[PDB]
Design a protein around this motif. Structure first.
Motif, PDB file in Angstrom:
ATOM      1  N   UNK A 109       0.828  -1.209   0.000  1.00  0.00           N
ATOM      2  CA  UNK A 109       0.000   0.000   0.000  1.00  0.00           C
ATOM      3  C   UNK A 109       0.858   1.254   0.000  1.00  0.00           C
ATOM      4  N   UNK A 110       1.892   1.257   0.849  1.00  0.00           N
ATOM      5  CA  UNK A 110       2.794   2.394   0.935  1.00  0.00           C
ATOM      6  C   UNK A 110       3.677   2.491  -0.294  1.00  0.00           C
ATOM      7  N   UNK A 111       4.075   1.360  -0.861  1.00  0.00           N
ATOM      8  CA  UNK A 111       4.900   1.444  -2.058  1.00  0.00           C
ATOM      9  C   UNK A 111       4.074   2.048  -3.192  1.00  0.00           C
ATOM     10  N   UNK A 112       2.784   1.704  -3.233  1.00  0.00           N
ATOM     11  CA  UNK A 112       1.878   2.121  -4.293  1.00  0.00           C
ATOM     12  C   UNK A 112       1.452   3.569  -4.174  1.00  0.00           C
ATOM     13  N   UNK A 113       1.746   4.218  -3.041  1.00  0.00           N
ATOM     14  CA  UNK A 113       1.483   5.639  -2.882  1.00  0.00           C
ATOM     15  C   UNK A 113       2.092   6.475  -4.009  1.00  0.00           C
ATOM     16  N   UNK A 114       3.207   6.039  -4.576  1.00  0.00           N
ATOM     17  CA  UNK A 114       3.924   6.815  -5.583  1.00  0.00           C
ATOM     18  C   UNK A 114       3.476   6.325  -6.955  1.00  0.00           C
ATOM     19  N   UNK A 115       2.734   7.117  -7.727  1.00  0.00           N
ATOM     20  CA  UNK A 115       2.241   6.612  -9.019  1.00  0.00           C
ATOM     21  C   UNK A 115       3.393   6.574 -10.013  1.00  0.00           C
ATOM     22  N   UNK A 116       3.441   5.496 -10.775  1.00  0.00           N
ATOM     23  CA  UNK A 116       4.488   5.261 -11.761  1.00  0.00           C
ATOM     24  C   UNK A 116       3.846   4.855 -13.069  1.00  0.00           C
ATOM     25  N   UNK A 117       3.111   5.755 -13.684  1.00  0.00           N
ATOM     26  CA  UNK A 117       2.348   5.393 -14.881  1.00  0.00           C
ATOM     27  C   UNK A 117       3.260   5.146 -16.064  1.00  0.00           C
ATOM     28  N   UNK A 118       2.688   4.531 -17.059  1.00  0.00           N
ATOM     29  CA  UNK A 118       3.444   4.104 -18.216  1.00  0.00           C
ATOM     30  C   UNK A 118       3.701   5.284 -19.141  1.00  0.00           C
ATOM     31  N   UNK A 119       4.956   5.448 -19.561  1.00  0.00           N
ATOM     32  CA  UNK A 119       5.251   6.203 -20.764  1.00  0.00           C
ATOM     33  C   UNK A 119       4.475   5.601 -21.939  1.00  0.00           C
TER      34      UNK A 119
END
Lengths: 382, 473
Positions: A252-262
């Motif tokens: 949950x905490x790791x997922x706090x940072x959004x890393x969307x796809x180029x």
């Protein structure tokens, strides 16, 4: 219990008087150290060569790629040049020694990353140590140009207020993850263990909070290089990650940072290989990568399922030692999709991630053999 | 200046002791950033505490601020007996026996002079000795003999402490010494009372029956039993401390951080002020500046949204207590006002209960954001509305106006509550006028700024909050 480790964060361990013999290096590696940092500020090229040969010896005993990070001192003082004449020498030595990673200190602006990469000429990827107020102001340019990042908090809290480091750290880790650059948190993570065999409560919290930010790496400096308890320090790092990553509240905490796809094929297949793996309950995501790029993009998505990064290039396998969760495995060149599938199933079974019948997600490039050609997600049975 | 308002909402709990005891010292720490003074009752005499208490309370006239005093009761002190040579070495896998024979101990045997252990300890249960340095496991137990196998060897010296992590023991969390220290704390009008050795909810109920509503109760969470029983204990208590020192002995030290994440989350969702304690700036016991890990630790508690951050020996016994307190203030001021802060706090959801006060706590916070309000002035007779609004963790600063001096002290432990003791009001207009003149007097608002007032229409009555009112100052 050396490979797999049971956690995906990478432990970076600095070598020095307390950790320098072959037996000592072996012991840190079994105790949890994944990347060895050789600091070029001190000592001689003579002594580093013995240390390098002793790190590499480990590949033969345990069949695993090692990872060596050469740290250039920079313009330490005891408006000025990125690489001193000492650094340019130490760099040429590090590249003689087939450095997996070179780190550069006291960068202040993007042009200093550029200067370094132009000297390095593709022979090794570059990690930048962020420790100067100017580096933080020039953060987006610096992070774009670099390959990896170190939040080097010791010097950062000298030249900036020490109360400014945590928010600056959150900023560096967030953005590093979003840009897909491995990021290492550094300095005093287990400082008390220089003298005591056990850590303070504040020290264990700091390590856990670096993990929850999703950082690729957590570092020990004098706790392994110069302290009275280097083995306990290295092992405590492994014990904290083993527990935190497998305790509630981690993802949950790791997922706090959004890393969307180029808007690329590789990022699209990384994201959707991860999701597909969650939906089908896959035991692992196996990524075929010539240069490591694809493995880095999957790592960026922070999948729950374990990654195995299968590469033919022994140098890529070594370099991937620093990438979150990458689990590199040098393999032979495969020439058909069939061969890739069989090698993917057999590798996942051999290191214990799957047993016959389990689902696996394979990310690959076909027709095979060329970098930057990733275009398949294949769900197979082991 | 730098005193009230502090420029940050988290609260600093500083332990008093030899390094921070004299009037001038206690005054210094207050100015340096300390908000709640913790008085540990395990050492010292009442006569000395009374001097300290009076010195804390003297701040109120100098600064026209309510002070806050937390009294921490020791609880049981479990220790082994003595050995013939003063110590022994325990070798791994040997048999080691605990009995009730006072005879001096040896490499096989020591007195365990606590009858209650012999009533609960059974096979598979561990005893940890010397801060968990030694582990032994019960292979056999009788009402008068406990036989163990040594799993983790080491020296074991005379009357070392021990811990019983794996089974609840039939021993009251308040010892006779504690009962007497508690009566002294209440006579000294403790704002908060801290219970140790909590294992079950019954320990909290027992403590609140003795206290008969004379001060609110903080429970220290130290022991695996209490984490198993977390929900029932959190519900019964009024406040929480994450007592990491003992938690990391009784559990794996690497397991504290996820357990701190859990405790702080549930404490916020339940509306219970939560304090993070132990070793937050430990290296400043000897050094005038902290390590990087330590500053990260304080900041990560703040980003969890905890109500408080605590110092023990750093202010009580160390060589740099002024710098240590001030450093807590500096970390809070920078982190709360830097980017990334509110997003991390908001990661923990704290939805409204189906009550008028919880709905209005939420409405006010959302209204303050939309209209750009400079403060949220909360009128409160017992502090309850202040907590519920504090619980929503609004961006706009809170001012908690209460007529009651005791409420104003106690709220010093509530996140961002900013208590002000005021005169009673009798109409809405009197409340608006007092709300605007308070927001202007402390620097939060200038004429024409918007404020959000939360109050109750039958004025003077507790439990009546039913109004949100937007006003200009």
């Amino acid at each position: 219990g050396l490979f797999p480790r049971g956690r995906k964060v990478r432990v970076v361990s600095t070598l020095g008087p307390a950790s320098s013999t072959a037996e000592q290096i072996r012991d840190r590696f079994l105790a949890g150290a994944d990347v060895f940092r050789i600091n070029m500020s001190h000592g001689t090229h003579d002594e580093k060569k013995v240390i390098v040969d002793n790190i590499r010896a480990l590949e033969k005993e345990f069949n695993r790629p090692t990872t060596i990070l050469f740290d250039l001192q920079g313009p330490k003082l005891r408006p000025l040049a990125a690489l001193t004449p000492k650094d340019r020498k130490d760099l040429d030595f590090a590249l003689k020694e087939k450095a997996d990673w070179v780190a550069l200190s006291f960068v202040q602006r993007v042009e200093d990353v550029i200067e370094a990469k132009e000297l390095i000429k593709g022979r090794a990827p570059l990690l930048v140590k962020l420790e100067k107020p100017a580096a933080i102001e020039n953060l987006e340019s610096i992070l774009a140009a670099t390959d990896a990042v170190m939040v080097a908090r010791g010097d950062l809290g000298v030249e900036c207020l020490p109360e400014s480091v945590p928010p600056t750290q959150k900023r560096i880790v967030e953005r590093s993850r979003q840009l897909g650059k491995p990021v290492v948190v550094a300095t005093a993570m287990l400082e008390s263990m220089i003298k005591a065999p056990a850590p303070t409560r504040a020290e264990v919290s700091d390590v856990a909070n670096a993990i929850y930010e999703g950082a690729d790496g957590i570092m020990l400096s004098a706790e392994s290089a110069a302290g009275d308890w280097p083995h306990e320090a290295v092992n405590m790092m492994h014990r904290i990650a083993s527990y935190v990553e497998n305790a509630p509240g981690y993802i949950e905490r790791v997922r706090f940072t959004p890393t969307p796809a180029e808007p690329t094929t590789v990022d699209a297949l990384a994201e959707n290989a991860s999701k597909t793996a969650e939906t089908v309950g896959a035991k692992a995501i196996i990524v075929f990568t010539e240069t490591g790029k694809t493995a880095q993009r999957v790592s960026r998505a922070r999948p729950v399922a374990p990654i195995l990064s299968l590469t033919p290039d022994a140098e890529v396998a070594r370099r991937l030692g620093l990438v979150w969760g990458a689990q590199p495995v040098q393999v032979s060149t495969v020439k058909t999709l069939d061969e890739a599938k069989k090698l993917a199933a057999e590798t996942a079974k051999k290191y214990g991630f799957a047993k016959a019948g389990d689902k696996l997600v394979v990310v690959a490039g076909e027709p095979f053999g060329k970098a930057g050609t990733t275009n398949i997600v294949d769900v197979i049975e082991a």
